[PDB]
């Protein structure tokens, strides 16, 4: 099966040529941070590491950082400055991953190196929609007969839509026995969703999260995860309303 590295999406014309030949996924607008469809877009207490502590391998803003424990990233004003290891989303400190074509789920994400447990993979970026916007896109994606869905609940009536604009996190497939999870992090007082490994993911293994999918559509998508505890369908047994799936 074909595979491509994350740096292949930074070349629109090469990517478009690869996509006509089925060597890369279809074109999408690559973004580095969420874009709000409508205009509606804190020091920790870590004692600064000395230069010698940094040389010794000591970590800055590690497991005991008050910002990290609350899933808040540090800013440029962190007491540990440049050494701060709690700015992964801002610095784009992504896991080494590849976009691969799967047998029946479309494109997916795989580990290019062994990924330890609790490793930041990528941020789930996209166009942040309100409920009015979410409903207009529900109608359009149903009209176009789209196979793949890219709506992620963020907060209350707000949804991150990675259908047209996003990054390689939009390729992560569902598994009923997942090896990743979402985590909601605050960066500059703004909520963001990232994917994190839930276990030691060996190199070459596909990265997947439990979508916990709220299906509004009439027909359930069969789940091809292949787990022993497979639920059979993305979205389980019951169908929910467009208002409930949208977070209301």
């Amino acid at each position: 099966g074909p595979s491509c590295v994350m740096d292949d999406f930074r070349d629109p014309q090469r990517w478009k040529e690869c996509a006509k030949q089925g060597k890369m996924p279809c074109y999408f607008d690559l973004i580095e941070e969420n874009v709000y469809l409508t205009e509606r877009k804190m020091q920790c207490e870590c004692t600064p590491l000395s230069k010698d502590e940094r040389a010794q391998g000591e970590i800055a803003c590690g497991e005991d950082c008050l910002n990290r424990l609350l899933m808040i990233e540090c800013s440029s004003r962190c007491p540990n400055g440049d050494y701060c290891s709690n700015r992964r989303f801002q610095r784009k400190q992504h896991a080494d991953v590849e976009v691969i074509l799967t047998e029946k789920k479309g494109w997916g994400l795989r580990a290019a190196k062994d990924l330890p447990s609790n490793t930041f993979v990528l941020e789930y970026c996209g166009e942040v929609l309100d409920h009015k916007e979410f409903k207009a896109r529900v109608k359009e994606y149903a009209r176009n007969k789209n196979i793949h869905y890219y709506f992620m609940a963020l907060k209350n009536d707000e949804i991150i839509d990675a259908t047209q604009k996003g990054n390689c996190s939009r390729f992560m497939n569902h598994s009923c026995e997942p090896n990743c999870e979402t985590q909601k992090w605050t960066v500059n007082g703004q909520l963001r969703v990232g994917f994190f490994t839930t276990k030691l993911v060996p190199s070459g293994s596909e990265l997947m999260f439990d979508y916990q999918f709220q299906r509004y559509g009439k027909e359930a998508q069969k789940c091809f995860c292949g787990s022993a505890n497979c639920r059979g369908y993305l979205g389980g047994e019951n169908r929910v309303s467009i208002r409930a799936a949208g977070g209301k």
Binding site: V138, K139, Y141, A142, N146, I147, Y149, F151, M152, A153, L154, I159, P178, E181, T182, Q183, K184, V193, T198, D210, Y211, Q212, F213, Q214, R215, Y216, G217, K218, E219, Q221, L234, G235, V240, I242, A245, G246, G247
Partner: peptide, 15 residues
């Protein structure tokens, strides 16, 4: 009458 579609919901892994 969407025949297909839904929303992914964030949640922490627990089981």
């Amino acid at each position: 009458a969407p025949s297909t579609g839904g929303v992914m919901k964030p949640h922490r892994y627990r089981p």
